[PDB]
Design a protein around this ligand. Sequence first.
Ligand SMILES: *SC[C@H](NC(=O)CC[C@H](N)C(=O)O)C(=O)NCC(=O)O
Ligand SMILES: *SC[C@H](NC(=O)CC[C@H](N)C(=O)O)C(=O)NCC(=O)O
Lengths: 201, 201
Amino acid sequence: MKLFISPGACSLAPHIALRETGADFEAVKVDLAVRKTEAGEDFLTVNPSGKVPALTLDSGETLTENPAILLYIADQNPASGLAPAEGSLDRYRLLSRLSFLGSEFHKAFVPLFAPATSDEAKAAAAESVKNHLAALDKELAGRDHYAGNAFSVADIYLYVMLGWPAYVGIDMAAYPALGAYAGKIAQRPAVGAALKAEGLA
Amino acid sequence: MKLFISPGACSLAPHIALRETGADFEAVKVDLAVRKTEAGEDFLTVNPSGKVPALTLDSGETLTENPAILLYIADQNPASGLAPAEGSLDRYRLLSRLSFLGSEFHKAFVPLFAPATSDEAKAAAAESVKNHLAALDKELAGRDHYAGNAFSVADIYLYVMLGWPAYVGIDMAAYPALGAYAGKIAQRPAVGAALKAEGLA
Ligand SMILES: *SC[C@H](NC(=O)CC[C@H](N)C(=O)O)C(=O)NCC(=O)O
Ligand SMILES: *SC[C@H](NC(=O)CC[C@H](N)C(=O)O)C(=O)NCC(=O)O
């Protein structure tokens, strides 16, 4: 099983998830600029969009999209309990959470990670990020978990993105509940293990 | 079961899905301009973000985000087969498609539907929508269905989005495979029934 990643990118979530489950896999780093793997291979052959994360199974089939990859990882080792049992109703809540993160929150940042983005555009994106953080901060105030009451891949996914604002000049001190929320997660050994492996710890 | 929608919006997907499964439900139209449902309620109470679609389940909860809602709708009637069964690898393939459609394709349109958007921003959005359309066309020229081997909620989700390009200045005659693809789905009884119900204004 190969998980294609890029240091600190959205692919960190799947990375942390695989380390939480202990499943075997090799992390293959990708140079998103040249769109080539560390080994030097052409990543476009793996995922035509050139984006990470990408998960290639032992069968040879590759899976893309964080929500799909995260749920897949969790389901291969249910003992880890990173996702509600298949068929359960809390599963849709999780899906909804993963989908909000990938389609709304994650996208609010994109303009801030773009080279030729107008000042007003950046100002607009920064404004959207903050509005999301404020809503997320209010939602998690007094709560430890984003989807339900157990630790899940949605928490891992959100944790990762919560490390992006400070990256784009936004001070998290304005969101106490998020800082507390993220702080707990940052301590799990799998988080530090994934980070160290990417060379960011 | 209640589905909150707005004529022709992204909420048309779940609407068609509920008709495909033959479920008993009610579609509550929402005036997005003032966040009020045709039932009088302040829609922000049903869904704090003020966005459709939103699905209040027969078990009491309100679900948001198309991928989650669409998957839930399909699962309620396994005899309809609108999504692969839990436990199958094919389910993740579906989740990946729903995720791409919701996080990449759908989002590429936003700037084109926004009022204050500048000409440059619109031009950039158009180019992004066109780039996805070209990839999707090439992709669907080789298969019958978008996700897997049979008609699924991913096809309904994509079909709805394929109904937007032309109205914002992107000639769909440029994508023959997509045109043929949408033309078949457009004929389904559930699709036309949803259009007939939404077209009344
Ligand atoms: S976070 C890094 C970028 N990946 C994505 O945006 C994946 C988005 C999907 N919607 C998902 O995984 O859910 C990335 O790889 N960008 C390429 C670049 O060249 O920056
Ligand atoms: S298409 C109509 C708008 N809804 C969404 O964009 C929902 C996006 C989620 N990511 C999803 O459902 O997957 C909408 O309701 N906009 C509000 C408005 O005032 O136009």
